[model samples]
Target: MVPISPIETVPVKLKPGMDGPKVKQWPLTEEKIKALVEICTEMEKEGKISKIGPENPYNTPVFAIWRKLVDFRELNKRTQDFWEVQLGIPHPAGLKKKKSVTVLDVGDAYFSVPLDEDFRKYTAFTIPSINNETPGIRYQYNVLPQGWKGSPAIFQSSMTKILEPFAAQNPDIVICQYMDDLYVGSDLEIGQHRTKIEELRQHLLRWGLTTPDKKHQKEPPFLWMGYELHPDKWTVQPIVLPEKDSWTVNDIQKLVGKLNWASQIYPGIKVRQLSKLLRGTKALTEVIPLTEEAELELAENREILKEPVHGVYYDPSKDLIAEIQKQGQGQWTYQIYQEPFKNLKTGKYARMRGAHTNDVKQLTEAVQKITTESIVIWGKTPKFKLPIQKETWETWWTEYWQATWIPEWEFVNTPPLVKLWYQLEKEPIVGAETFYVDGAANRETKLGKAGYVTNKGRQKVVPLTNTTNQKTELQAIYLALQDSGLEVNIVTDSQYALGIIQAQPDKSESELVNQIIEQLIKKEKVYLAWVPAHKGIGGNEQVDKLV
Candidate 1:
């Protein structure tokens, strides 16, 4: 297949898929890089993983060796690993909205691994000794390849970025894609399902990925989920794959294991008459051999329609609320996550070793985010009557944030320049020919707007569909640079955006700030000046409305 040039996160090819091999890779053989990686890895152990990458990309050239020394594995070794997804699951309340499900599995998906060229040199390898000519020659995977031990995790991580915006962010379409498989569903109508799915397909295409004809599931009632969900079919149950005619007890063991997993998730257990035999059969209480009579019986058994039972099964295809209601109301136990956390606010902190975590199902609904309005602390995780008192939730009565949420950052601090200017209702210098910028957003509306003005007799304002207040504020500064002149004083209300240039931001605002810096450097210089929002200055009043 034709290959493309390496890029950090951009599509490697200016064109789409190509048909032959890629350009040869140049291996990085630097000694200093190893020292850097060793030191940086210690930081990773100490929880400073983000410090490595652009302490300048020399964290490259060493991952091949890096992978060998401090290798990490999948979060779990067995079963379908869905740990990475934190998107809210559906509520189990019976059908306030009717949704058609569409599952899309990618084709030749491994080929879509987008390479972060910043780390490409680390993947270098020797070229096969073709014809024994220059056998020690080298090449590298521009994209992560299948054979690498860590390829699965790397590729999955990359795809998470590609699909994240389209998944939970899109109002009309909801998707949860795992590796190459896409589980898509919509809150719209049957006729519109085709249109929505097409839009999702277009999104996949933009990411340099393609879908196979067979992998697309347009019609409802198809089985990709553990449960069979359909518009007409009422029962949600599992799919039973038939075995070859000649079967031994070993094959049945596998089938039983499969059934066990499905049973925990799906409500009904079919072949319970047979399940009665399978509670965990160490050896056969039975076996049906491949005789003509035996084969007839096996075929008959396989033909029996898989049916449902009375107990609650976690059918993932359905909305989250139903199972949630069942869970809270059922026989329950206190369960902690991977490691139990030490209650750091109290004596438990010193007695405890590492910081562990909990799923918090004890206090919050497992299906949803625990917002302030959604919780009740019960005066320190109190004792319950029938259920609560007997078990004691024996896991501590309170842990850190036992009744709280970790507040998110809003770029909330004021800029140094803003303190000088706006402290006494003072303002920065501006000319009649200048740029004025401001950003605004509302919690109720979930909308944002960014705008700029220049006494050069013009202004710009554009709506942001989905954004944080800080992003809108930062984008306003970048857009102000659209003047692209050699010199200009930009007047704005957000010192936060101005602060981005004076100091490097810890996150994405730096990119936007750097772009503005790039445009400014093309000029003699730029004066970034500001006004405060909502204090009723002429420019501030107008800018405030736009927010």
Candidate 2:
């Protein structure tokens, strides 16, 4: 046989599938473990990590590192004791018991003596550690490793061993081990879920583990492991709306943000119902003219020109005499006469006079002829027309002019004429009243609704929920007329609500409002009318302000 070199010496007598030298226990020094614990203690002080229960369960990164340090220390102590016992040293029963108490199974491998305390219930049974000599076996360490890749697996397995009794007893509880996200929850029939949680917490604390605060401690009915719990029973609490007025848009936005999702539960709000309110921070501008000057300017620019011309001069010419002659019976002449003149040199043309002798006869004859023709064609003239047999033209003219020019005429006639189609003068079906309602919600109390009554004698604010603006308005009106209710006429700003009451139908933000209206109208006591909103006349405005 050829002599083998030292490098090829019998291939280390390896067994089949045996990888390399085994490292069942970590070679961590006591000083390193102490240092690790001190780091965790500092982290706890900084509020980065917190202890959850009497067992001192740690739910944070720092505590996790400390837990690994503790495991390593216990493992070393146990191994030394086992060796000493094998070397013929008398092992004390107390030491044996303590050793038993400190054993920890981390991931695939086992380690003795976890650094944390032990919860009483979980310690009732202790299973022997799995013994395997395979190299590169996976394991988990509570503290992150500087070089080892399987530290997490080793630490996790140890924690699993420590928590196995609790898990077996409370099958409903969920346990997961990631780097630091150690979550636990239940889905069992037992109502005493709190007891299980307390036990788990106690065990974890004893082993230097902890849970998060109540806020972060999500339970069930919501979600725990991979399962979604029952609908009626949930671990998470419902969000609420706020009570302050100075809330920013974002503040309200978050509260109503999931409205699209939760709205199904309400059943009242239809899709896109809150679109108007969702219009972001941009402003809307509408051009409106509010002054007479503005009106005049508009009219002038629009080329509207029907105004009267003032200070016109009237003169009789030779053509007037000829036209009078054509009428066969009238005779007319052209003439001029002089009066006091401001400019003496300019002659009679510059004179100003109320009447002139030379012009009077011709002017009167021309006027009379024109008046006669106007009577035959257009019925009447201001002067020189034949008087009525009973009532004179002067008397009729005076009464007509006075009535037309009276100041109240503008107010009475104009508004009526402008709004004739609206029938403003018609009494609104006698007992008609309008009700208005509005809702507000924020991050605090979730949602709130208010209604107002606007009947002539009755007005009040009504509070409600799970109802739409329309339903609330109708409810207000119904309540207003509940006692001694005459034939009630109802009006609402919500067209959809009014349509339902009137037996006509339209799309609405809230289907609940439509249903309510339909139910109310079936009683036959209510007649519905659609009214414009925000006008001072609508009683709803008063109700809205009051609410």
Candidate 3:
């Protein structure tokens, strides 16, 4: 017996003021009539379709294909199709290692959904009699019809809702659902994998969804959507390409569409390359000449499609590495370890190149911004790398002093601190002007800003070019020092800026640091004090907002 789902029945809704089509039944061939009759008889026996009387006004013709009855050519034309279905297909890009995979499909997916009783008459279809001139029987679907535009979307939504709770509870089993097809992936042993699948099957059965008893899909390397997802790799399903010499504008358009879909599964087929072939094909049938560049691109794409792209699953225990390669000139390409990468000459992940000025600077700023932002948000820094000279990476710990002055390495390394100390007096310094200074950098815009506000209500904000956040902080400190020659206390929230003064060795690499030191010495009795940032301090809070 076919179990009925508890989900709400779907309605055959029509557009506002649109009447159902009242046309005569469409003619069917002899063999089609026989097939239709046989399928209708089976559907009636299963109560999927009911023999409605002659009182029904609509008469959509039904056709038999692949031993299934499909109607709604006329019904679909007048029906409203406003509901949107999500189009995301689950990909195996996150799988780090080979998994035991099983594919399950619901039998009679759309037909299993029952239709609303009030709207059932809108699904009225004709079953032509075998012998000619006699009027045929009219049938209306009790369950949702396959060919209706809303069936797939409604059923998909229902199944998605049905699986949501189960998916949330059983987090270990990776369930990839595309409408009726469910691809379950697990890293567990075979016995455990089967146990999980059985649990999932039982869960689905409780919702009136059934998977055929003997219909378990073949083991890994099974086809999902258009790609053949294997244990360790995925291969694009082959398609017949139009002949290079005889193709028309329409042919290239179709090819581009197919390749565009395949490109989602196979990252090697760049969408940019596919678009080069589509050059404003105004007329579908007009013959067009394929340019040499386009032909070369197509040849490369075809070669890429012929090979199986290795699919690396994401493993949390393993380090996630981003491999970047320099394309022609300053152009760059990068991908995470899980992403399928091609065109690297070494056949291995490529490390970064330090020589490319713009790319390296951008990458360094981005990595720093990510680490800084993570610390700001989560109170912890994330693991990140600065793309610098390969040789200089070793000296990250050894030669700390020499590393600080290297302007290229300045952003990555902390500035050298001078060995000096300042004793904050127990009482306030009499009549000394105090300035609160702070700096911030917007890595996205490549802009660094520094600002300082004095206790006397005098404030200044300036932009520092070719500087990082730490450099900007130093710049702000320097600016505050330069603004006053008299004995004054310089208040700053930056520990790094204070560290620079406390570790005041006689010599330093930063010109700004040298200038700050000069101002400190020139004005004797200058006090440098550290204050907690954004702690309701008037000057510090004001300057923080300014930056």
Candidate 4:
């Protein structure tokens, strides 16, 4: 299902001079606003959702309030000292004793304002303030300020310095920090990555800061500051919907912009839905109630066909009546014709009862003779040896020609069939020498098959089997190349095989077909191209017949 914005109208401030500013007020009634506020209040009552840190039972708002009241830096120093003793690390000033072990400090803190009137006023102008306590001047003056500037910088600096003595002791260990993020890797080499994370967790526990148990704390690549980090890859973390009330139109527009930024990651999302919605909106405006451009175009189309032509006519005479009756009968006749014959006798009966019974009988006799002759000459059991050339064959052909062609010669004075046959044998057929190779893979068994055409438009089967489809497909392709003895454009229906062929600086089958083609161009063996099959295309049809 397509994602849809619940908002039907966008909220905009009323400006005195702007046209329609007052006219464009949101359609939401007072009752609707009340309901929406109630919902928001209910969600807020559930407690603040932290953007960072491990999940815990402690409320985020309470935690933020506590941090504002306490001296976090002093708390961090005490926690560091406690963990140092617990881990058996020497004191901060012990120059010689501190040279043996390393310790890491990890904690979570945010930059925010203290509850002051001036600070509250500054915050109100920049940030959204939703809840109201009272309407009086004293209430506004007593408003609590949030989001202080120095909190994050001070927290990060003090935390880093607290761990400096431990880092100095073990020169092998590296201390890294980004805001509240901290890691101590062993020596920036062997144990650097894992050691830092282990020490950080240990210190977080030592400090009064309890890491939220809900946040993911896996090893190696993890999310920090909107960036994904791993041993090999790094990417900016994408936005996800917060567990909040229904989004406004502005929220949807913001989401769409972010979606477009990461479109390469999730292609065809907004465009696919918005296109239909916009089309529907336009279509609705063209009906009787709304009536717009589509109606105009439809009216113009009708106008073009208003006049009648003299020659054009419609009649239901005897021929038309007969045609309608024949059509009605054809369906039942087709159903009877499609029924399978039960036996050889039934088949013979069906064949003999056709509209052209005499012609059918003659064709059947000719086919029977050809089958019998073929069996006599090429079957497992040997019959009389067939002569390669005989006087009887020449005499039979001469007599046949005289009987059939003599009359035709009398009418046209030419032997058309013989003349055309001689002309055709004199030149090459266009695209007649072409070959096709295709690969197929069995999904169930993960087996593969390969097939190819090399005998122009003739069928010639290779006598190998019981192999995977891909192997067979490759074998056919290789065999075609060997038989052709020249570089040619090899057309195939397999995208997989095509990718392998175009590999750069390598012609190995293991390296995708496309990469192989890239390498082959250097050696100048063959060029590769893809051609679709079926759909009545000429070359592909010929290749199909050959295969």
Candidate 5:
């Protein structure tokens, strides 16, 4: 057994299906192989991973970074543990003046714990032959493998147990452990704090756990969970956005995760802004063209992170206010404020906002968990009567009104939508380059083509299959609008295209029409005019001939 820690060897107990064939490993390039061999050599020297014969029945894949093991889902399904993630930061109300702090990060935390002798073969991993240089090698881990389902829980509990004695003795100081990070903070006594830090390091070393020297922190401006904690306030870690403008769904997910983690430090962040980033993301592989709304949200949140977030002490004497607004039919957003009317002019008490479903039970539970004496404010007036009797919603009012804790709600007018569509000339005009668009569909073949010709020497013809003349015309307008970043006027012969744009977009069923409307709304001063087909108009006839 590796003498890395005093913790007892843990078993990777599994249910059935241990006789399945080994999972295939991907081929590694020469550089990846060199890196893998280097890591393997280091682990072998430390008695963490050792070369093994091919006699073991179970084998997983080995990658450049670490070993790829059994399917974690299958492993977790067989073995379950009652473990929940715990945040180690102290409550703001309970915090004392801790001017001196030290953050200690464990070196290779999970790798320090040894695995049980019987289960070592289950963690066996194979490496391919290095092209005539060396034969293929199989290795098994003596320590807790990286990809094991129970590694995190086992490591956390072991660390907690190891720190129990240090915690008991240092009750006067604050010591919080989250995963592999160990935080030690004390009142403005640098001498005592330094001595305590030294003692804690020694204590960890006694258990065969060593903290990395380079990762140690001795000052106030240390980062914990992405928050730069100072003596008085915590500053958010500034986000480094990608150089490119567009992002993949995976990139958005990662950015949102970081932003959410930082938001825990500053609770006043608007949820709507974050929700806008994920508007069109459907899968991890999909590419997201950052919209104007998404770009604004990112910039706003980045600006918010630059400022230090101060903690507010809770006061029972302050009056409470619960404000709720519905975004959609069932999507409701609520914000609870304390002493919202203290200043009367500035409502600084809107601390956090959350989203919930249409269910009244969940809403009541949330409101009741906080103060029950708060004033309830609704964005719209409540309706007690249902339009239809004996429907599912008929019983909703009965349950909603029974919650007496929610006081009489005062109604506030919802914000109106900004006007985006402006029909200049009510007919047509343009100051920028003008483009004449046309579309032709061959009824016999059922195919169509959309074409546009600008007076300033720009033209395009796009072939479309299984389309009608109206769809092709709408497509032509969309293409013309998309072609110019600055303002540009488009003239189409199809009156149907002009009718679709003048009418409300809700009634429009064609995606091409919606896209044309979106382009019209987004661009600056886009003047659309209609011209008669085959009227011998110079630009119109040119586009029609091309179509």
Candidate 6:
């Protein structure tokens, strides 16, 4: 018999809105687990989809970004981003013309989208499934309820099937749906809009469902999906409009939340401006502080709302190849160009500027380095509105980035070749031996110790000159390097070391780091890796015992 995987439930907040996509903690009991186990086994038998258990290896979490509206006009945000220009109706300059917008809503959407005729048992629970008239519950998903993990997919999927005939029949009437929320658009007028809406209503009528009327309105664009979308009038944003607002925590909190969505979709405002401006969530209790910067930002916020974001610029031809060539006059610099970068899509862009050796490897390595490093700059610049030709990234962009920034490389390369730099493609010295490094601090002794365990079954321990345990971590790596050959791997259990190479020369071991930089240029290897400490790994346990 299979053992029930150990489980626990923890109490969480009522507010999914407050935290956005992040949700955690849930209560679990024997009944829930047993129910879920039965549900899991039934789902597995049908093979309609993937696995349910965490250990099953087939499970994938749904990406939360899919829910937001994209372009606010054509498609939902996540879906809109993936659509290619060729997929939509042809227009002048390959840009899309607007479909005349007709908005639609349902009285009860979640419960209305029915479970598929087959596989009802997968979604079924014997527990109470309440409805307005039923007074209690039913199973096999007689109603596709909200907050079910699969409900969003089920609602969107079945509605998508219903809309299938429209691709040809209703080319003029484009209908979009988000759970119960819907949009109908065309080059047609209200008569055609009403007809299209009527047909959809009949479709839902056949399926036995309807939606509530509160948030639904026709195309004057009063409010749709939490956005005040009236194109004719300018609007300010918030949670609910405050009665008297000079600025309270609640007002600012809601405003900031809406601004977060707006700035992301619009791209005109600073991405995290309010978040940067405020002190913290403590801002909830605090009164608005008056300041000149805040006043300026308040005015700028309105201006950003009024303006359209046609574009922002990205240029990747700052090629690192030229930088390598320009600076590598004396040192061995590879003529760099890595191959067509791999794409995120199903197909390959081009496998390689393949690397082989000291010659080919250096250029390939240099090009590869450029691609990885551009992540920092691009992290701030999201992949929005990339041209068809440029939307995918590859080696040339990395080379392009280097051409832009490599003056510093040349500057640093000149001094650092006296020390070290990228593009040189120096031979990496994989370790002749592995060393487990461990550190300790005894506050009572006002001292620290750095321990090293060699693969040769030998060990070294040294008292640190510095008082800090952090110093001992730094010193432990040094102790490994001191005893080992030019090439060696140093393993440690410190989180501090995880970021050690990340922020160089900013540690108590700065002098050791500076020395390693020069020694690295001369082909010394000082690679440090991490293993979680004290969970009973052999070398770590040995070092811990001594410490």
The prediction achieving the highest lDDT against the true structure is 3
Alpha carbon lDDT of residue 158, candidate 4? Answer: 50
Ranking of models by TM-score = 3, 5, 6, 1, 4, 2
| Poorest 10 consecutive residues by lDDT, candidate 5 | 342-351
Clashes of each: 19, 40, 12, 40, 0, 19
Please write out the lDDT profile of model 6 over residues 463-508, one tens digit for every residue: 7544566667767766766677757766788787556443332113
Q: Compared with the true structure, what per-residue lDDT tens digits does model 2 show for residues 66-184?
A: 34322232222222111111223211100101000101112222222222222111111111122322221122222323222333444555566667877787665566454334545
Prediction 6 global C-alpha lDDT = 0.43
RMSD, every candidate, angstroms: 30.2, 41.4, 14.3, 33.2, 16.2, 19.3
Candidate 5, residue 468: the lDDT equals 77
- What is the Å distance of residue 304 in model 2 from its true position? 56
Q: Name the 10 consecutive residues with the lowest summed lDDT in model 2.
A: 93-102
Question: What's the distance in Å from true for residue 234, model 1?
Answer: 7.9
- What stretches of model 1 exceed 4 Å from their correct place? 1-98, 105-110, 126-137, 164-169, 207-220, 225-227, 231-547
Residue 527 accuracy (lDDT) in model 5: 73
Candidate 4's displacement at residue 108, Å, is 23
**Which portions of model 6 show Cα errors greater than 4 Å?**
1-97, 104-172, 178-182, 187-217, 228-258, 266-444, 447-466, 469-499, 502-547
* Cα misplacement distance, residue 164 of candidate 6 (Å): 5.5
Across residues 196-221, which tens digit of lDDT does each residue of candidate 3 receive?
88888888887677787786656656
Best by TM-score: 3
Positional deviation of residue 420's Cα in model 6 after best superposition, in angstroms: 10
Residue range 1-547, candidate 1, lDDT tens digits: 5343221353222213322222232343444334544555553354323321222211112234433222112211211232233344332112222467667777455655655554344434332233334433333345554443445665666667767777765777666655567766666787798687877777777755677756465456544344444553323355475656555566656565554444332332232333334445566645644445434433444453245422222233432211111122111212111112311010000011212212233223322222211222111221111112212233222322244322221111221101110111123334424677777777767688888766655777889877767777777777767654655677677766655544322123246655655565455556677677677766544544364
Local distance difference test values of all predictions, in order: 0.44, 0.33, 0.63, 0.32, 0.60, 0.43
TM-score of 6: 0.34
TM-score of each: 0.33, 0.19, 0.54, 0.22, 0.49, 0.34
lDDT of 5 by residue, 1-547 (tens): 4454568765555556544235666677777666677777788999889899868866676665454333434334544453655533443322334667678888466688877777676677767767736756778888766656677777777788888988998787778776677778777478888888888988888877777767555565655555555565444566554545678878877777766555544443444544565776677788767767667667776776666454332344544344544333222334443444221110111222332122343333444433322222212222211112232223444333342344334434443211224333343454587888888777877688887888888988889889877778888888898897667788888888776664434213456665666676677677778888887887875345344
> For residues 1-547, what per-residue lDDT tens digits would candidate 4 score against the true structure?
4332221111112133322101111223335434534443442343221121222111111111212221123212221111121223211111111111232323433221112322222121111123333221111111111232333434444555555665766675556565445544442544554555455555544543334444445455455544444443333355453332443344434444544433322211222232222343433333222134323422332342233111111111211100000011011000001112210000111122221112212222333433343233222111111111234334333533223111000111221111100000123334434556655545455544454555455323454435555555555556455555334456655554544333211223243333333334333345555666555544443333233
